[PDB]
Design a protein around this ligand. Structure first.
Ligand SMILES: CCCCCCCCCCCCCCCC(=O)O
Ligand SMILES: CCCCCCCCCCCCCCCC(=O)O
Lengths: 123, 68, 283, 267, 235, 60, 283, 68, 235, 68, 123
C-alpha cells in the first residue's frame, strides 16, 4: 500500500526546463507501474514500467519529456524541457500494479497530493 | 499396506548418492475408510484430443486432400 | 565418487632433494594455478588426514534461511479515514543485502525455494483495547494476475492462487516452490536489454532499462488481515525467510565489494572505499 | 624433441590464421570447448544455419594504444563483432543465436619494456552506471560501443546533468566496473601478458548463459576486460607506447529464426 | 488416533533446519536443466584459485590500482623488508579482501595449507633473487633477512619462469584457527627479502612491480558457517 | 505416546495443498458413474480445437 | 565387554586363615591403592551381588540440563527515551556454579551440546495495558561475526547465522550442537598465556591474561523481541539450559572446595574456610 | 519405502554396544508428491578444482617447466 | 494426515529427559578425537582412589594442614581413643570433604564396601601396634579399647610396610543407605586404639603423625543423582 | 532402519505373558542427519579402575609384600 | 545491553597517581572490548580485550597507564601514574563487541556518564 509524494515543482519561465520528483512509500515500485498524469483536471503524460524498459508518452507531449526510475531511492522523476505556457498544469503521479491500463484515469488505485507547476509567460 | 510411488525429479541435488540420481519415491498410507477421504494421486492419464479435433466419420490423413 | 564427507588427500612423507624437477617454479601467465601440496617446498611427515569439506558443499553454504522482506499491514478502526493497509511485495531476494551477496558468487543457478513466514503483531493506540487472535492471508499473485485493489475484493477468493492462511501465534507458515525459472537457471546478472532500440521508431518506444528482464519476475505477494475492522488499531509485520535447497551454480564471480545501491550492479559515490590503511612493512 | 614449445602456437579457422612465438599456451575456459547445440538441450524447432567458416574466422577489431596513463579497456560479445562480415549479417538476420569465441589478444613490446596486462573474460560482464540519481539507466548506444570498445576510469565521476544525462558506463578500474575487487577477478578465465614472458593471450570461451539459445542483439554473453596490472615503463622515457590488438573468432555458431533485417539505432 | 506427545522444540523455527514441507505449485512442470559449462560443488574450489593480494594499503595507495603494486628497485644490498604480512587470512586487511579471504569470512575455523605465488613484473633484462619467507608465530616479528632466513622460506630466482611459489604448510597448535585476530590461534609472519638485489643494465627502468596471488592447497578446509562483515545495509 | 515434535507449518491452511481428511458422510452410497460421451482429461485438448479469432476490434 | 548395567563382582565365601599371605599390608608410598575386597579382612559369605553402576556412568552423571544464563530483554513504548533492550551473552557454562563444578572433576572433554530456552514474560508498568503473544529471536553470532548494534539492524537478517524464532507460550525451544571445539577436547582449565611477552617489544604489547584462550571462545547469543514497540512495556527473561550428551572426559581433579570468584581458578578472601568444627575424639 | 542412510559419527558415546561404534543410520520417508518438497540430502559429491585451477589446453606436470 | 492424539506431557520440558532434537550446524566437520591418556567412564573409579581424611577438625586445626595430622605419642598404655568417627561418608564433616565424600553428595543412596588405609609417619626406629576398629550401629559408641575390640577390627603392626588396611564390609539393614544424617540408615563407628603403645629409643622425636586415606571397594555403588550442597552462588 | 534394544526390567508387572517376564525391548529411530542430534544411548561400558588404582610399573599381587 | 559507570575519579596534584573504576551492567564483558577514551572532547587512551590478553595504549600515554579486567566484579579500571597537568581531562569508558575498531570514537555503541579528573598544578 504505497504512498506517493509530488515534490520538486514550481514556477519557471517559458522555454526553460524543470524537473519533478515523485518519491514513494514501501515497498514502492512493488505496486508497480508509475505514471505522470497532468492536466488541471485529468490527462496523462508519461507512463512507465517498474520492470524492463518500458517507456511511452502522451502524443501531445511526445519528444520533450522523460520518466525515469530510481529503484534505490524509490523515486520516479519527470524531466520537462522546452516548456511552454500550455504546460502550466496540475501535476501528479500514479500507480497500479495491473501491468496494463495506462489509458484510463479512473483505473488507478494510488494517488499523491500534487504540485502546481507554472510556465510563466515572461517571453 | 503402504503405497510407494515415484516422483518426477526437478532440481537434482548434487547427489546420486541419495537424492537426485537414484529414483526418489514417496510413501502413502490411507487413514480413513472412505474413498472420498483419500488424497489426490495426481498420477493421471492423458489422451488423444481426437474426440474434439477429428470428430469425423471417415479417417483423416494429413497429407491428402480434405475434401475429395 | 568423491563425496562431501570424505577425508582430504593424505600428506605423504618427503625427504631431501636435488633433482631436475621444479615444483616451485611456475608462470601465472598460463592462467593455470600451480598445484603445490605440502610435500613440495618443505619436507613433510606422513599424515593420515582427517578433515573433510562437508560443510563447504554448495548445499551447505546456502543451508540457512535468509530474511528477504518485511511487509506491513494493520487492522484499523471501522471509523478511520484511511483504508485498511494491505501489503504487496515484488518477489525478490535483492531487497536486502546478505542473501543477495551470497547468491552473487555465481553467475547462474537452480534451486527449489522454501519459504517461511514469522508474523508478529502489536497494538498502536494508547487505548486498553482488545483484539482477538488475528488471522493472516498470504497470497501469491503470479505475473499478470489479479492483484488486489482493496483488502476485500473478489481477488482474494483465490480459486487458483496458492495462498496461506496463518493463525497468529502458531508454528510459522511454510511452503515450498520448485524451480520456476523461465530459463534453465535463474540469472543473477543479465548483460542486456529487454528491448532493442530501432531505427524507424522513436527513442521512447525502444528505450529499456539495462540489466533487467522477465527472468527475475515471478510475481508478488499480497498480505492482509482477514479479520474485519476492530475497535483498536492493530498493526502487523510479515517477515519472509527464504532458503535455497537442492542447489546448483555456474561460473564464479568475486563478491560484492562496495555497498549496494539499487537492483542493478550500480554503485553510489562515497561508498567507493572498501579498504583501510595498513603499512607495507609492518605486521 | 621436434621443437614443440608452449610459446610457439598456430591457430586456424576458416580463412584466417594466427601464429605466435611468445605465448603462455592457451586457456580453454571452464574446461569446455565449443560445440553445436545438442538435440538434447535444444530449444527452438526450426532448421539451424551453421555458417561455419563464413562466420567462423578471425576478425581484427580496431587497435588501441597503451601508454602510462591508461586505465583500461572493455569489450562485449557478441557486440564488438556486430559489424564483422557474415557473422555480422546473419546475426541481424535472426532472433536467436549461440556462439563461442577465441579471443587472441596480441600485444608485443621488447626485452626492454616491462609491465603486465590482465586479459580477463567475464561471462556476463555487467558494468555499472554513471549516476547516483537514476540506477540501471545506461542507454543501449553506450552499452554497445562495438569495436571501438569502452574504457575504464581511475576515479568515480557522478553525472549531475538531470536535464539530459549521459547514460553511459563509468567503470572504475579497481572495481572491475562492477563493484568487486579486481584482485579477485582471477577466477574468470584469464591470461596475463607480462611483457617479459609472452607477447599475446588466448582464451577460448564456450557459450555460457542460462539459456540454450538466445537473442544476440539483445543479449551479450562474454565480456572482455583488459586492465593494466603493472604499469608500462620504458628505459628512461617519459612517454612510452605500444599498441594492443584483439582478434576474437567465433566458433560453433548457429542461428535460428530467419526474419527481416534488424536496423538498430546505434547513436 | 495414534498416541503422541509433544517435546520441547515444537513450534520453533530454526533458520538452519531441514524439514520437508508442503508444496505451493503441485505438479509444476520443472524445466529440465542443461549442462552449462563450469559448475561448482564446493567453496574450496573458488579458494584454490590464485588471488591478487592488495598488499600496500598506505594512506595514498589504498583503494586504487597502486595497492597491488609492491615496487622494487635497483638499490644496493640491504636486509630490510620488502613486505611484511600476517598469516591472518581471514582478518588481515591485506588478506581479508582476497577471494580466499572472502570465503573464510563466512566461516569460523579455517585449516590447511595456503600458497602464495609471486609474479615478477620487470623487464627481460632485469634479474635478481629474493627470499620470501614464513616463520611460525610466538616470537619476534623478523625485520632483518637474517631472521626470516631462519625459518620456512623459498629462495627465488628471477628468470624465464617469471613466477615462484612458497608453500606455507600447516603448522599450528590447534586443528583449526580462528578466522579472527586472536593470539592463541595466531598465524605467523610472511616476509620477502632481497637475496642479492635487482640488477639492470643501461637504458632500463630502475623500478618495476610485483603482483601477489594467494590461494589454498588441496588440504584446505573450513567449518562453522557464519555471516560476514564486509557489507552492511544501513537504514 | 510416540515422541513427536512440531515443525513450522503446523496449523497452516494451504489452498493448494493435498492432505487426507475425515469424512462427513461415512458409507454414503456413491452412485456409480455412467460412460457419458466426451470426456476431457487435460486443458490442452480444449486448446487444440480451432477458435475464431475476433480480429478487427475497431471502435465500431 | 563390561557395560554399565552389569552386576558387580560377586562376593566369594572365605573362611579361617593363617598363611604367608598379607592382604591387609600395603604401603601407600607406591602410589598404588591396595585392592581389598570383603573376603579379605573378614570372613564373608557367598553373595550373588545385584547392584550395578548404571547410573554412575559418565553419560548419566551429566544427564541433567543445567541453567547457564539469564538474558533480559524488553519491549518498551514507542515513546520511551531509552532503546529497546536486546541481550548479548558470551557463551559459557562458567557464569553460574553448579554445571561448572560438575565439569570440573575432569581436565578435558568432548560433548555435543544440547540447548534449551524456557522464556518468560511480564508487564512492568501499573497500566492495564495489552500485549499480544510475543515472538522471540535467539541469534548465534560466532566469533568475529556481525554482532547486532540495534534491535533492528541488518544483522538479524541472518543469511548465515543459525537463529531460533520462539513463539511465547509453546513447548520450549531446542537445538543441538556437536563438538565445536578447536582442539580434540575442550579445556576446562588452561595453564598458560595466549601471548608470550617478548624482549624487543614492550610490556604492554606482550601482556596477556593467565588462564584464558580461544579454546573457550565459541561466540555469543543475541536475543530480542521481534515484535515492535507496544503501548505497554513488556520485559522478558531468557533462560538457557545446557545439557552435555554423548560425553567423554580425561584425567580427574578434586572438586572446587571454596566459593567461586571469576572465570579463573582464583579465590576471594573470607571464603577460604570450607570446613567446620568437629572433635577428633567424638562421634 | 524408507530411505535409511549413514551418519558421520562425531563424538562417540562411550558406546559400541549401541551408539558410537556400530554404524549409526537414519531413516527418511518422503511425505509429499513433489521433489521440491523433499528434504535436503546433503550427501553431495566433490570434484577436482581443475575447471578453474588448470584451465589449460595442454597437460600440466607439476615438476617440469611451465613454459617450455 | 495421520490421526494423532495428544497425551498429558506434551509441551513439558524435562531437565532430565532424552529426546532427539534438530541441529544448529548441519554438516559441521567434527574434529576427530585423539587418544588422550587417562579416560574415565564411571564416577566409581574416582572413588576407589584413596583420599586423605581430614580428621581433626578442632577449632584451631581446621582449614589448615593440621586437620590431616592425627598425632600420636609415646605415652604409657591407655584404652582411650586416638580417633572416633561416624560411618556417614556423605555427611560427616570428617568424611564429607573427601573425594569419596564428594562423589556421594551428588547421589541419594550409597552402598557397598569402603576401605580406610592408615599410613604411619614416624621414624624408622619407632614401633607399635594399633587397633583400628569398626562396629555396626545401634548401640553404645565405644570409648574404650575393650569395646571396640568386640567388633570388626584389624590389629595393626608398625613396620617396614608402613601402611595397613581395615575393610569395613557392607553390613546394613537396607540395600542402600541415606547419604545423610539419618538414624534408620545409620552407618556405625570407626575407632583407632593403641594395642601396646608407641615405643622409641633415645634421640628420637616423641611425637609423629598419621595420615588417613578413604576409598571404596569394587562393590561400591550409588543411585539417584541430586545436587550437592558444597558450593553456593549468592547474588 | 530401526534400533531395537533391551531394557533392564525393574518392577516386574505380575506378567510374563507380556511384560515383566519375556524380555522387554524398545525401538529407536534416528530422525536427523547429524550425530549430534542423536539420542543418548546410555548403553555405555565400564572399565577397570587400574589406570588410577594401580598406576604402578610392576605388577601388584594383593597377597604379597608391597615393598620387597 | 550493558550499562557503564565511571567511578573513582577526582582532584589530585601533579606527579601523583589516581585510579579509576568502571563497573558495568549485565552480562558485562559480554558486549566485550572495554576501553578508556579521555579527552575533554574525544581521544583514546587504553583499549582492552575481554578475552585473552590483550593490551594496547595510546602512543601519547604509553608506559604510564594500565587497563585491567575484573570479570568477577564486572569492573574495568585505569591506573594513572606520574600525572601531569595535561592529564586533567574528561574520562570515560567504552565498549563494542566488534573485536576490532579501537581507533574510532564513533565506532562505539556503549558509553557511560563520566568523571572529571583534575591534575592540580600544586608543584
Ligand atoms: C505461496 C508463495 C508461492 C511463491 C512462488 C514462487 C515465486 C518465485 C520466486 C523465485 C525467486 C528466485 C530469484 C532468482 C532470480 C534470478 O536470478 O533470475
Ligand atoms: C543456536 C545456538 C548455537 C550454539 C552454538 C554452540 C556454541 C558453543 C558453546 C560450547 C560450550 C562448551 C564449553 C567448553 C569450554 C572449554 O572447556 O574449553
Amino acid at each position: 500500500q504505497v504512498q506517493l509524494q509530488e515534490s520538486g515543482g514550481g514556477s519557471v519561465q517559458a522555454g526553460g526546463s524543470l524537473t519533478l520528483s515523485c518519491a514513494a512509500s514501501g515497498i514502492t515500485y512493488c505496486m508497480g507501474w508509475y505514471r505522470q498524469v497532468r492536466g488541471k483536471e485529468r490527462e496523462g503524460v508519461a507512463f512507465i514500467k517498474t520492470n524492463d524498459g518500458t517507456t511511452d508518452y502522451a502524443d501531445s507531449v511526445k519528444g520533450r519529456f522523460t520518466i525515469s526510475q530510481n529503484h534505490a531511492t524509490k523515486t520516479v522523476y519527470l524531466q520537462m524541457n522546452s516548456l511552454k505556457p500550455e504546460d502550466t498544469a496540475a501535476y501528479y503521479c500514479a500507480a497500479t500494479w495491473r501491468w496494463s491500463c495506462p489509458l484510463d484515469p479512473e483505473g488507478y488505485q494510488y494517488w499523491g497530493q500534487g504540485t502546481q507547476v507554472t510556465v510563466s509567460s515572461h517571453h | 499396506g503402504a503405497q510407494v510411488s515415484s516422483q518426477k525429479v526437478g532440481a537434482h541435488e548434487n547427489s546420486n548418492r541419495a537424492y537426485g540420481g537414484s529414483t526418489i519415491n514417496y510413501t502413502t498410507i490411507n487413514y480413513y475408510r472412505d474413498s472420498a477421504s483419500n488424497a489426490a494421486s495426481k498420477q493421471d492419464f492423458s489422451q488423444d484430443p481426437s474426440k474434439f479435433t477429428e470428430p469425423i466419420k471417415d479417417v483423416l490423413i494429413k497429407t491428402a486432400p480434405m475434401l475429395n | 565418487a568423491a563425496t562431501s564427507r570424505d577425508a582430504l588427500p593424505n600428506t605423504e612423507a618427503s625427504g631431501p632433494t636435488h633433482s631436475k624437477e621444479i615444483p616451485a617454479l611456475t608462470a601465472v601467465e598460463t592462467g593455470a594455478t600451480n598445484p603445490l601440496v605440502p610435500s613440495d617446498t618443505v619436507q613433510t611427515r606422513h599424515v593420515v588426514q582427517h578433515r573433510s569439506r562437508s560443510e563447504s558443499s554448495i548445499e551447505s553454504f546456502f543451508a540457512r534461511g535468509a530474511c528477504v522482506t518485511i511487509m506491513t499491514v494493520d487492522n484499523p478502526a471501522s471509523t478511520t479515514n484511511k483504508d485498511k493497509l494491505f501489503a504487496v511485495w515484488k518477489i525478490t531476494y535483492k531487497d536486502t543485502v546478505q542473501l543477495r551477496r551470497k547468491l552473487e558468487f555465481f553467475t547462474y543457478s537452480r534451486f527449489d525455494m522454501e519459504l517461511t513466514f514469522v508474523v508478529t503483531a502489536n497494538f498502536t493506540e494508547t487505548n486498553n483495547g482488545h483484539a482477538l487472535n488475528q488471522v493472516y492471508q498470504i497470497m501469491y499473485v503470479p505475473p499478470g494476475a489479479p492483484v488486489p485493489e482493496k483488502w476485500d475484493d473478489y481477488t482474494w477468493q483465490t480459486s487458483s492462487n496458492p495462498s496461506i492462511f496463518y493463525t497468529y501465534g502458531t508454528a510459522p507458515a511454510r511452503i515450498s516452490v520448485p524451480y520456476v525459472g523461465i530459463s534453465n537457471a535463474y540469472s543473477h546478472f543479465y548483460d542486456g536489454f529487454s528491448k532493442v532500440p530501432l531505427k524507424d521508431q522513436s527513442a521512447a518506444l525502444g528505450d529499456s532499462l539495462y540489466g533487467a528482464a522477465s527472468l527475475n519476475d515471478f510475481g508478488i505477494l499480497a498480505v492482509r488481515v482477514v479479520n474485519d475492522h476492530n475497535p483498536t488499531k492493530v498493526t502487523s509485520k510479515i517477515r519472509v525467510y527464504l532458503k535455497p535447497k537442492h542447489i546448483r551454480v555456474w561460473c564464479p564471480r568475486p563478491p560484492r565489494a562496495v555497498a549496494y545501491y539499487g537492483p542493478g550492479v550500480d554503485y553510489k559515490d562515497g561508498t567507493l572505499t572498501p579498504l583501510s590503511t595498513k603499512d607495507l612493512t609492518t605486521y | 624433441a621436434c621443437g614443440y614449445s608452449d610459446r610457439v602456437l598456430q591457430l586456424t579457422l576458416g580463412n584466417s590464421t594466427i601464429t605466435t612465438q611468445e605465448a603462455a599456451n592457451s586457456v580453454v575456459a571452464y574446461g569446455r570447448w565449443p560445440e553445436y547445440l545438442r538435440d538434447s538441450e535444444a530449444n527452438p524447432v526450426d532448421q539451424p544455419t551453421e555458417p561455419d567458416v563464413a562466420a567462423c574466422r578471425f576478425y581484427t577489431l580496431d587497435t588501441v594504444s597503451w601508454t602510462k596513463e591508461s586505465r583500461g579497456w572493455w569489450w562485449k560479445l557478441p557486440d564488438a563483432l556486430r559489424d564483422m562480415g557474415l557473422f555480422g549479417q546473419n546475426m541481424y538476420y535472426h532472433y536467436l543465436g549461440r556462439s563461442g569465441y577465441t579471443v587472441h589478444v596480441q600485444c608485443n613490446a621488447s626485452k626492454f619494456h616491462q609491465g603486465a596486462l590482465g586479459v580477463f573474460a567475464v561471462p556476463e560482464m555487467c558494468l555499472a552506471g554513471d549516476s547516483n540519481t537514476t540506477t540501471m539507466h545506461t542507454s543501449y548506444q553506450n552499452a554497445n560501443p562495438g569495436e571501438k570498445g569502452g574504457t575504464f576510469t581511475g576515479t568515480f565521476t557522478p553525472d549531475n546533468n538531470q536535464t539530459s544525462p549521459a547514460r553511459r558506463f563509468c567503470p572504475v578500474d579497481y572495481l572491475l566496473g562492477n563493484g568487486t575487487l579486481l584482485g579477485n577477478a582471477f577466477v574468470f578465465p584469464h591470461q596475463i601478458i607480462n611483457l617479459r614472458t609472452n607477447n599475446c593471450a588466448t582464451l577460448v570461451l564456450p557459450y555460457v548463459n542460462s539459456l540454450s539459445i538466445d537473442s544476440m542483439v539483445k543479449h551479450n554473453n562474454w565480456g572482455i576486460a583488459i586492465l593494466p596490472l603493472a604499469p608500462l615503463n620504458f628505459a628512461s622515457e617519459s612517454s612510452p607506447e605500444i599498441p594492443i590488438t584483439l582478434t576474437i573468432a567465433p566458433m560453433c555458431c548457429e542461428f535460428n529464426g530467419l526474419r527481416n533485417i534488424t536496423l538498430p539505432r546505434l547513436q | 488416533g495414534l498416541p503422541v506427545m509433544n517435546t520441547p522444540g515444537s513450534n520453533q523455527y530454526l533458520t538452519a533446519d531441514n524439514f520437508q514441507s508442503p508444496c505451493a505449485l503441485p505438479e509444476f512442470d520443472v524445466t529440465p536443466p542443461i549442462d552449462i559449462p563450469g559448475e561448482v560443488k564446493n567453496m574450496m574450489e573458488l579458494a584454490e584459485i590464485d588471488t591478487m593480494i592488495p598488499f600496500d594499503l598506505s594512506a595514498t595507495k589504498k583503494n586504487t590500482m597502486e595497492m597491488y603494486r609492491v615496487r622494487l628497485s635497483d638499490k644496493p644490498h640491504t636486509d630490510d623488508p620488502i613486505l611484511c604480512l600476517s598469516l591472518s587470512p581471514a582478518s588481515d586487511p591485506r588478506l581479508s579482501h582476497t577471494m580466499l579471504g572472502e570465503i573464510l569470512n563466512y566461516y569460523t575455523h579455517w585449516a590447511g595449507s595456503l600458497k602464495f605465488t609471486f609474479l615478477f613484473c620487470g623487464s627481460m633484462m632485469a634479474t635478481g633473487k629474493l627470499l620470501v619467507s614464513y616463520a611460525p608465530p610466538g616470537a619476534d616479528p623478523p625485520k632483518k633477512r637474517k631472521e626470516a632466513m631462519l625459518g620456512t622460506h623459498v629462495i627465488w630466482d628471477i628468470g624465464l619462469q617469471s613466477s615462484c611459489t612458497m608453500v606455507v604448510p600447516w603448522i599450528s597448535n590447534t586443528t583449526y584457527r580462528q578466522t579472527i585476530d586472536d593470539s592463541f590461534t595466531e598465524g605467523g609472519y610472511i616476509s620477502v627479502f632481497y637475496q642479492t638485489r635487482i640488477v639492470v643494465p643501461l637504458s632500463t627502468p630502475r623500478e618495476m612491480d610485483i603482483l601477489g596471488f594467494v590461494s589454498a592447497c588441496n588440504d584446505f578446509s573450513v567449518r562453522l558457517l557464519r555471516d560476514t562483515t564486509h557489507i552492511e545495509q544501513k537504514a
